[PDB]
Write a protein that holds these residues in place. Sequence first.
Motif, PDB file in Angstrom:
ATOM      1  N   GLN A  51       8.577  -9.670 -21.911  1.00  6.53           N
ATOM      2  CA  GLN A  51       9.067 -10.485 -22.943  1.00  6.53           C
ATOM      3  C   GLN A  51       8.368 -11.956 -22.251  1.00  6.53           C
ATOM      4  O   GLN A  51       7.528 -12.679 -23.084  1.00  6.53           O
ATOM      5  N   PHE A  52       8.454 -12.586 -20.973  1.00  6.59           N
ATOM      6  CA  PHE A  52       8.214 -13.601 -20.721  1.00  6.59           C
ATOM      7  C   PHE A  52       6.588 -13.624 -20.077  1.00  6.59           C
ATOM      8  O   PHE A  52       6.277 -13.405 -18.934  1.00  6.59           O
TER       9      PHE A  52
ATOM     10  N   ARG B 148       5.270 -22.925  -4.425  1.00  4.56           N
ATOM     11  CA  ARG B 148       5.095 -21.781  -5.237  1.00  4.56           C
ATOM     12  C   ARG B 148       6.052 -21.669  -6.263  1.00  4.56           C
ATOM     13  O   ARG B 148       7.321 -21.869  -5.820  1.00  4.56           O
ATOM     14  N   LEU B 149       5.856 -21.227  -7.375  1.00  8.27           N
ATOM     15  CA  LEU B 149       6.734 -20.572  -8.333  1.00  8.27           C
ATOM     16  C   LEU B 149       7.517 -19.297  -7.729  1.00  8.27           C
ATOM     17  O   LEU B 149       7.105 -18.713  -6.943  1.00  8.27           O
TER      18      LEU B 149
ATOM     19  N   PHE C 221      16.685 -21.763 -15.564  1.00 12.55           N
ATOM     20  CA  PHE C 221      16.025 -21.012 -16.797  1.00 12.55           C
ATOM     21  C   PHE C 221      16.623 -19.630 -16.407  1.00 12.55           C
ATOM     22  O   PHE C 221      16.228 -18.743 -15.494  1.00 12.55           O
TER      23      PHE C 221
ATOM     24  N   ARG D 260      17.735 -15.556 -18.816  1.00 13.17           N
ATOM     25  CA  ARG D 260      18.063 -14.761 -20.276  1.00 13.17           C
ATOM     26  C   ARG D 260      18.770 -13.355 -19.300  1.00 13.17           C
ATOM     27  O   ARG D 260      18.653 -12.975 -18.564  1.00 13.17           O
TER      28      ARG D 260
END
Lengths: 57, 71
Positions: free
Chosen positions: B38-39, B40-41, B69, B71
Motif C-alpha cells: 500500500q505504501f 539514505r532513507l 511513521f 502502520r
Amino acid sequence: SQSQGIQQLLQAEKRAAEKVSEARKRKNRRLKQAKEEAQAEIEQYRLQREKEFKAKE
Amino acid sequence: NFEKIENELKEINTNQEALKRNFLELTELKFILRKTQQFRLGFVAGVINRERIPTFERMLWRVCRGNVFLR
C-alpha cells in the motif's frame, strides 16, 4: 492520509540520490577546472618571466 | 538399526521443523507484503501479537524520539 507518506518516501529517494549525484559531478568539474586554471595562471607567470627577461636581454 | 532409526528420527524432526518453519515464515512474508504494498532513507516491516501494539508504538516513539511513521 497514506498518499503524503508515499510522496515523502518517493521524494526522499529522489532528493538523496540526485543532490549527491549532482555534487559528485560538480566535484569532477571543479577538479578539471583546477588543472585548467592552474595551467592558465602558470602560462601568465611564464609570459611575465619572458617579458621580464626580454627587458634584460 | 537403532542408530538408523535414531538418526532418521533426528533428521525427520529437523526437516519437519525446517519446512514447517519456512512455510510459516513465507506465509507471514505474504501477509507482510500484501499490507506493505500500500505504501539514505530506511524502513522495516514485520509481524507482532496485536495486544503488544500500544506499548510497541510508545517504545518506538521513545527510542526514535518523537518521530516514527508506522502502520
